[PDB]
DNA sequence: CCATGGAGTCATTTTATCTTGTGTCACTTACAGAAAAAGTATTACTAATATATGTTGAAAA
């Protein structure tokens, strides 16, 4: 996805970087909202809560 | 100057008002001014003070 | 990637817990490292272009309010065209425009060609011109597909009022994927049936709209629309179901596009027919079109619209061409004999009337033919597959586009049936790719057969043969009312006396320049 | 270039000049490691030192 | 030979700069107009799709 794309595929988009963060912090927490939405640009976007 | 570029060559009759091209030059004055009260700093090309 | 120097573990994980940071192999229980190290706190021919090139796409871009990333996405299309070297000689916008709509396409948003087209004095055939060569240079294949579904919403937020409307949406959807299934969808712009839709179900909503307001949106005309009103209204169950319950009926009756009932009203195995077929010939001898084309009983000379003379004629129902130059095209041909023989007749004029002018260069250039299956066809599905071979859009034309190089033709391709090709080189070739690709139509269908033999007719040669191929042979196919093909004397007088009588300006200004000629002194 | 004169160009010489960096800021000031910061509260019964 | 006067000679003033400003966190965000290359679009045609536009119009209600 970094990269410059071609119109030129045949099957694996299937490599992915995964990046999930990590909660770090020096005790327990909970989640007790989390939000999908979009916002004008029409792609998606989570923004969640501790 | 967007309007120039429509009187300088006149092939045929051109009116057709230019006007929608008040959409492609538009929204500096809008974005432009979100990205200002978002900044904290102004610009203020008449009396280049800032 | 590395590997732990003893323990040979090769999996890696890094205790971000005690703010330490500090990677290590679950194999071994050895850091490979040590803290690790992170960050903190245009003169050019083609690049300043190039700021040009975001700069008037990124500004005429979001005009539309289409996404900042779509238009990156096509910037990177722009540098591919330039490449390819496609942004040469043709006008910025037709270009910029096609950039953007590939994209557009490619991720399949709402907006429409006609409807983007529209932000300049684009006849629509201009950029949809562009944007198909630009694809005859790209192998960019499959991906621009489209339905209503799309642009239904976009249309709604202009149709105010309230949020019935997309209850009502909900509603047209059902109704536009039935449309898709009673088979009236196709061949059609995706604006007409979506505001379409649109109309019955607030027909449905019992509100009070206007065509005016539906092609407000949809840029079509009303009568166009209303066509699809009653292209409805013929349909089965169209009034007998048109009452409530949501259409519970989902099912399929036949598939009838108005297509071949045309061929009704006016009412493999089949052969396909010749239609026309180019060729050239040159006489080897520059001329003065003027001056032989003043004894003619057909004949057009208008340098100012069109450089050379216009040769045609009823028999044998021909047309041809000439040149300045002692060339000429031979157009008018259903077959060969027609063909060279007719183009031998062209030449008793001159070699009666001026110049030497022999037939030589005769060459086939391009070939014509035509056919119906007689059944309707789903072409989606096809430009689904072969788009590789295909080229489909939707309503930029109806006639579908297939590119195929063995042998190399392309092909016209209708849901009706009738189905036409050209760009041939060969008789045979009609039969190769012809009953070649029938096995796809015939493979594609929804719910004679037999080519008979491959070739049967005699080839193009039989035909070039049974006219007399020698230049010099001449009168021989003269009809003799090619002595009464010239007019007399007086008619070129007079007739050129007024022809002149026009363009003694255009000549003159002509000599005007060649006068300026003599001002290349000072 | 962009034609906006932005500020941002010196800091070679200035590097090693003023405020936080290699004049002494950084290098006599350097930053340190094995260290933690909290704030603070007595205990008398804690003896001193 | 000594005198005035001039010419160098060197103190000396008042200008017009250039540096620096206690240390610490919280998060931190080019210029316009020229000449050339060139390739494309018209500008002819047959030549067959079936939309789309229109207009009109004529007929029908
Ligand atoms: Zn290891």
């Keep these: 996805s970094a990269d410059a794309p071609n119109p030129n595929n045949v099957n694996v988009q299937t490599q992915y970087r995964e990046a999930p963060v990590i909660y770090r912090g020096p005790e327990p927490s909970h989640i007790d909202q989390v939000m999908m939405s979009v916002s004008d640009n029409d792609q998606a976007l989570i923004k969640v809560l501790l | ?50 | 990637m590395p590997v732990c120097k003893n323990c040979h573990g090769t999996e890696f994980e890094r205790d971000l817990s005690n703010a330490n940071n500090d990677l290590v192999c679950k194999a071994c229980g050895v850091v490979s490292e040590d803290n690790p190290i992170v960050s903190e706190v245009a003169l050019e021919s083609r690049e300043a272009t190039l700021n040009n090139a975001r700069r008037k796409l990124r500004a005429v871009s979001y005009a539309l309010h289409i996404p900042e990333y779509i238009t990156d996405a096509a910037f990177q299309w722009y540098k591919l065209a330039l490449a390819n070297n496609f942004v040469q000689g043709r006008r910025s916008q037709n270009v910029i425009a096609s950039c953007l709509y590939v994209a557009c396409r490619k991720e399949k948003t709402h907006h429409m060609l006609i409807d983007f087209s529209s932000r300049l004095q684009v006849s629509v055939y201009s950029i949809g011109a562009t944007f198909l060569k630009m694809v005859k240079k790209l192998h960019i294949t499959e991906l621009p597909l489209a339905d209503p579904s799309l642009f239904i919403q976009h249309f709604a937020e202009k149709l105010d009022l309230a949020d019935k409307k997309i209850k009502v949406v909900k509603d047209a959807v059902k109704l536009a994927q039935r449309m898709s299934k009673d088979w009236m969808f196709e061949g059609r712009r995706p604006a007409g049936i979506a505001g379409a839709c649109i109309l019955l179900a607030c027909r449905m909503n019992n509100l009070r709209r206007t065509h005016t307001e539906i092609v407000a949106v949809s840029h079509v005309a009303e009568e166009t629309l209303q066509q699809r009103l009653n292209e409805f209204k013929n349909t089965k169950a169209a009034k007998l179901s048109v009452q409530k319950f949501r259409e519970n009926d989902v099912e399929d009756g036949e598939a009838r596009p108005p297509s071949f009932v045309k061929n009704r009203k006016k009412e493999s195995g089949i052969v396909p027919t010749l239609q026309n077929i180019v060729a050239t010939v040159t006489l080897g001898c520059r001329l003065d079109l003027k001056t032989v084309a003043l004894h003619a009983r057909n004949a057009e000379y208008n340098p100012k619209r069109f450089a050379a003379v216009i040769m045609r004629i009823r028999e044998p129902k021909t047309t041809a061409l000439i040149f300045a130059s002692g060339k000429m095209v031979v157009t008018g041909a259903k077959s060969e004999d027609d063909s060279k023989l007719a183009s031998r007749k062209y030449a008793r004029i001159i070699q009666k009337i001026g110049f030497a002018a022999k037939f030589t260069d005769f060459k086939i250039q391009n070939i014509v033919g035509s056919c119906d299956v007689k059944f309707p066809i789903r072409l989606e599905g096809l430009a689904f597959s072969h788009g590789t071979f295909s080229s489909y859009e939707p309503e930029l034309f109806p006639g579908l586009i297939y590119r195929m190089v063995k042998p190399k033709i392309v092909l016209l391709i209708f849901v009706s049936g009738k189905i036409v090709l050209t760009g041939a080189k060969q008789r045979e070739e009609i039969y190769q790719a012809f009953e070649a690709i029938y096995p796809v139509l015939s493979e594609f269908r929804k719910m004679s057969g037999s080519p008979r033999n491959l070739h049967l007719l005699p080839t193009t040669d039989t035909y070039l043969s049974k006219v007399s191929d020698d230049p010099d042979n001449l009168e021989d196919v003269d009809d003799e009312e090619l002595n009464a093909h010239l007019l007399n004397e007086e008619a070129s007088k007079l007739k050129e006396r007024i022809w002149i009588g026009l363009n003694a300006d255009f000549l003159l200004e002509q000599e005007s320049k060649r006068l300026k000629q003599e001002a290349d002194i000072a | 270039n962009g034609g906006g004169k932005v500020k941002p160009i010196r800091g070679f010489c200035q590097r090693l000049k003023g405020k936080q960096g290699r004049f002494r800021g950084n290098l006599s000031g350097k930053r340190v490691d094995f260290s933690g910061r909290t704030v603070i509260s007595p205990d008398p019964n804690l003896s001193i030192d």
Excluded: Q
């Design chain 2, 1 to 50: 100057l967007s309007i120039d570029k429509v009187l300088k060559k006149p092939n045929r009759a051109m009116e057709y008002d230019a006007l929608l091209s008040i959409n492609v030059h538009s929204n500096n004055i809008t974005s432009g001014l979100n990205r200002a009260i978002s900044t904290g700093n102004w610009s203020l090309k008449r009396f280049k003070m800032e």
